[PDB]
Amino acid sequence: MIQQETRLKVADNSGAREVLTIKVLGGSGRKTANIGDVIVCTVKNATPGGVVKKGDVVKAVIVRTKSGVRRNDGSYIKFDENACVIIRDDKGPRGTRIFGPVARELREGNFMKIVSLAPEVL
Amino acid sequence: TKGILGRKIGMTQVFGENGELIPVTVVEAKENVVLQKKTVEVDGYNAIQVGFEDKKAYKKDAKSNKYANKPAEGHAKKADAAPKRFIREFRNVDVDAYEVGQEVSVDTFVAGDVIDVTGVSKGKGFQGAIKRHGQSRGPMSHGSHFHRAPGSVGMASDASRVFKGQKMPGRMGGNTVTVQNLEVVQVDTENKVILVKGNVPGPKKGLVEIRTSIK
Amino acid sequence: TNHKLIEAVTKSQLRTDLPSFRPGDTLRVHVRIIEGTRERIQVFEGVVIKRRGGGVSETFTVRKISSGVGVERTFPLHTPKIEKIEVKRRGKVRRAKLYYLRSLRGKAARIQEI
Amino acid sequence: AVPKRRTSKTRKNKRRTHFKISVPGMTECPNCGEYKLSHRVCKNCGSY
Amino acid sequence: YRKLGRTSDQRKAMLRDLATSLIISERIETTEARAKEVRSVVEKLITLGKKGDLASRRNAAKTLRNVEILNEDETTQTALQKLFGEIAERYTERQGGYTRILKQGPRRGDGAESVIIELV
RNA sequence: UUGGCACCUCGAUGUCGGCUCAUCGCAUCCUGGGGCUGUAGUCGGUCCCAAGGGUUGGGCUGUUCGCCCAUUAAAGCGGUACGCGAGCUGGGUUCAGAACGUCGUGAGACAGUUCGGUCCCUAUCCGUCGUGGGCGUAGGAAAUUUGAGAGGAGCUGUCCUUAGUACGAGAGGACCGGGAUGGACAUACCUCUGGUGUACCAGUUGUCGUGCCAACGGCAUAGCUGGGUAGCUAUGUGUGGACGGGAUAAGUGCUGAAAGCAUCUAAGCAUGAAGCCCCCCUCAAGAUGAGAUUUCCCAACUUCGGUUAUAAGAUCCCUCAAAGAUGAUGAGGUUAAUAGGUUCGAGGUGGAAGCAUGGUGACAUGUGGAGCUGACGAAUACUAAUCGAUCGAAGACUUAAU
Ligand SMILES: [Mg+2]
Ligand SMILES: [Mg+2]
Ligand SMILES: [Mg+2]
Ligand SMILES: [Mg+2]
Ligand SMILES: [Mg+2]
Ligand SMILES: [Mg+2]
Ligand SMILES: [Mg+2]
Ligand SMILES: [Mg+2]
Ligand SMILES: [Mg+2]
Ligand SMILES: [Mg+2]
Ligand SMILES: [Mg+2]
């Protein structure tokens, strides 16, 4: 469950350290998001340098919610923080050094570049 | 085709192909018999009626429902049968099958049939507008005294009455409702159960009506 | 007979291969992952936080820290996508639900052996 | 809040037609005494 | 279970003082709902008395109030000693029951269904 | 809309916005179908048909409005006392305080600002949302139904194939079809994930008490704290919208005169939409037209006036919950498993007390997945569902076939 005005850690070296969501894109009236959902968001704490800077409005994909996802075999997965990877409007990222574990459930959302730049996917 | 009566035992889960967990409602569709065959030449419509759970015979000083009365003896005697607690008609079936007295067993369905399950709801009692209907409640602070009331009930003096269909409070209620396009996943012939995929209306030990999908 | 039907129908899908564990125990869960290519097996080593209600819906939960980020993972105990469970290390706990480890990081989330 | 009109003597008596009271149990005590209330043990003037 | 029109502690204190006095006098006159609920209390407390070990002596004193019976010949036993000593010897063959509820008429101040609960 | 008029109301028609709940128009915002195009395609433009459904979330402003950030298939316009305060707020403003600007000699004033400033009502009737009783339905009952009718539903994106095909110089890029999935919504349910769970389990502080130790008990929000069954629950699980038929709108025609021709119309004959009627889902014979099927029951006294009893059937009463404000509904009432108790479980808590051992101790370990366990499951008549009482039909005429 990630809605408007949730602070998320940014899980790569795209230039951002914290980001808050404006809208959950998708359909009209869409309230929450989970792993694999793209959100549009403004960075609040930014690294000095990098690419993005404080006050940019970026699109970004959800990796590793704290209220994680359910799988077809009745399995679950949950994480200790909400994280996020800033993408570059072709489902490809801005950085090359994605941090932290990524949920498996975005392999099927054509985020294969985010998977290959990541640590162990679970 | 393919109607049957049962009762809700409860709810479990089953694993399938490639380990997929699927939720499951166990329905004990036991000791159903065909109890009266209805014809258009006598009634105007073709149906059978199935009696579900047999109860004890006629007793003279019977004070409750588990002993049948004399109209229910003679009705379930015109078929060679025991008197049943529940009796329902099924008119989607073919009337040219189902001789009167046939024990319609649990293996009329195969794993993978689409079905409709008819039952009553639970019944919640007298409930208010934001629970009986999905109404937005008022603000809980900022000075307000409107929380769980219904809102306005009309317009001022054009329509000097309240229109019907207003969605006011009252009994949430156990009323009949169908869930459509459920699957049969597993038919245990010896236990006389059906595992239907998902949840069906009603409380436990209720009454269901598993008949095949009209869609 | 009501009471056997929850049991006697779901009985042939419950498992027997699995070892005996409890919360506090370190496990090596050998979950198998099937993509469109093959039937690869990935190991998930963590500490059992929770074991809840019985039947074929027995459900356990292990906890791992992957890249500085703690990861909860929850399995049906009788699912056919766990090829093997090894009990790596026992644990001296005094609860049944170890939810206090979620706020403990580093060496403070340490659980003894036996 | 307030009644706009008075209720008549006719409308008042139509409302309180279900404002009644029922006769009680009234079973005999076969050992000794007068009528006891049904499914109750007697206290005075009876042997239940 | 019934709430009896009281708080979780006002009901608990009422229900173990009503179960103690049904050990002292062995038949008490209460209302009907308060006897439906002390029925399951004192029958679970005679079950502890039929055991008679020390571990359930400690459990019957969870419930019983500290009331002293003046028995015959000026001898005094407590309600804990009278539960494991007299009631426990009466029902050592019976597998349940231990009480009955005899309904009576309404009271005068209320329509409260009076009830004698006895110890059988 | 701004007004005009002064007709209703000054022995009161009480408040601008917002909130909650809507509802209705169509001069249509999206989706449906068409015409024309200065329409290659992709996009458009414009006009016509159409109300079925849908029509976002923030920032600033008391604001209506407006601007703006994001989205979206689209963020329609209006009416309903500028809908709705005996449904809610009271920021806006006509109250008393105070201050500035301005005006006035002044007291004061502005319709200029600024800070502060009490929101009454136990619902009689109508109307609505549920729910009973009475009587009727030409014998009385029990059960299953017909559906005259009424209500609900009705939205839509994205992607993949067709196909880089048609088209196009290129750039670009289709219809038609097929398939996959969503969003929003509506439902049912607690298996999972969770929430709660005040008669469940454990830890622990203070103080008082059970003579003391040890064990407990009271109070301290349930003293706090860690969990947690049943049940209720969503944010959790399931489904749903679909198709498909008729009749049509705009339109498109075929044949065809009147009017030798031509002509979609006059006679004919087609085709044609999220619309209309079904299809789907509920509810429905108080449908006074009171329907139908199956089974059960069958009286005499007797100016048959009525009474006496009763049938089938119920009910009182009593044990209850899958039901419930009440009552109704359902499970039962001894030939009984209805509830409690007991016994055995399930799940929960996490290792009882006592004892032993070790440690100077605080404490550890063993005895021992131990004890305990509210609603869950099974068994068991131990306790209580006692004896009883009340109600309940006798089948009207008329005519027609038989
Ligand atoms: Mg709201
Ligand atoms: Mg009003
Ligand atoms: Mg009267
Ligand atoms: Mg207290
Ligand atoms: Mg004039
Ligand atoms: Mg129009
Ligand atoms: Mg008014
Ligand atoms: Mg002033
Ligand atoms: Mg001056
Ligand atoms: Mg103030
Ligand atoms: Mg005290």
Automatic annotation (TrEMBL), chain A:
Give me the Gene Ontology terms describing cellular component. cytosolic large ribosomal subunit
Tell me the Gene Ontology biological-process terms attached to this UniProt entry. translation
- Annotated family: Belongs to the universal ribosomal protein uL14 family.
Q: Annotated Gene Ontology MF terms? A: large ribosomal subunit rRNA binding; structural constituent of ribosome
Q: InterPro entries per the record?
A: Ribosomal_uL14 (IPR000218), Ribosomal_uL14_bac-type (IPR005745), Ribosomal_uL14_CS (IPR019972), Ribosomal_uL14_sf (IPR036853)
Q: How does it assemble?
A: Part of the 50S ribosomal subunit. Forms a cluster with proteins L3 and L19. In the 70S ribosome, L14 and L19 interact and together make contacts with the 16S rRNA in bridges B5 and B8.
Q: Which organism was this protein described from?
A: Staphylococcus schweitzeri
Q: State what this protein does.
A: Binds to 23S rRNA. Forms part of two intersubunit bridges in the 70S ribosome.
Q: What is this protein called?
A: Large ribosomal subunit protein uL14
Query: Sorted alphabetically, which keywords does the UniProt record give?
Result: Ribonucleoprotein, Ribosomal protein, RNA-binding, rRNA-binding
Automatic annotation (TrEMBL), chain B:
Ranges for region Disordered: 129-155
- Keyword Magnesium attached: no
Q: What is one process in the GO biological process aspect for this record?
A: translation
Per the record, the domain of life is Bacteria
Pfam families, per the entry:
Ribosomal_L3
InterPro entries recorded for this chain?
Ribosomal_uL3, Ribosomal_uL3_bac/org-type, Ribosomal_uL3_CS, Transl_B-barrel_sf
What GO molecular functions are on record for this protein?
Answer: rRNA binding; structural constituent of ribosome
Q: Where does Mg(2+) bind?
A: 136
Q: Does the keyword Phosphoprotein apply?
A: no
Instruction: Write the record's keywords in alphabetical order, separated by commas.
Output: Metal-binding, Ribonucleoprotein, Ribosomal protein, RNA-binding, rRNA-binding
Q: Name one GO cellular component term.
A: cytosolic large ribosomal subunit
Q: Which family does it belong to?
A: Belongs to the universal ribosomal protein uL3 family.
Q: Provide the function of this protein.
A: One of the primary rRNA binding proteins, it binds directly near the 3'-end of the 23S rRNA, where it nucleates assembly of the 50S subunit.
What's the subunit arrangement here? Part of the 50S ribosomal subunit. Forms a cluster with proteins L14 and L19.
- From the Swiss-Prot or TrEMBL record, give the protein name: Large ribosomal subunit protein uL3
> What organism is listed for this UniProt entry?
Staphylococcus schweitzeri
TrEMBL record, chain D:
Q: Name one GO molecular function term.
A: structural constituent of ribosome
One cellular component term (GO) for this entry is: large ribosomal subunit
Determine the domain of life of the protein's source. Answer: Bacteria
A GO BP annotation: translation
Q: Which UniProt keywords are listed?
A: Ribonucleoprotein, Ribosomal protein
Question: What's the family?
Answer: Belongs to the bacterial ribosomal protein bL32 family.
Q: What is this protein called?
A: Large ribosomal subunit protein bL32
Species lineage: Bacteria, Bacillati, Bacillota, Bacilli, Bacillales
From TrEMBL, chain E:
Key words, A-Z: Ribonucleoprotein, Ribosomal protein
> What residue range is the signal peptide?
none
Example GO biological process: translation
Q: Record's superkingdom?
A: Bacteria
One GO CC annotation: cytosolic large ribosomal subunit
Q: How does it assemble?
A: Part of the 50S ribosomal subunit. Contacts protein L32.
Q: Which family is it part of?
A: Belongs to the bacterial ribosomal protein bL17 family.
Please identify the protein, giving its name as recorded. Large ribosomal subunit protein bL17
> What is the species of this protein?
Staphylococcus schweitzeri
- Give the lineage: Bacteria, Bacillati, Bacillota, Bacilli, Bacillales
Name of the encoding gene: rplQ
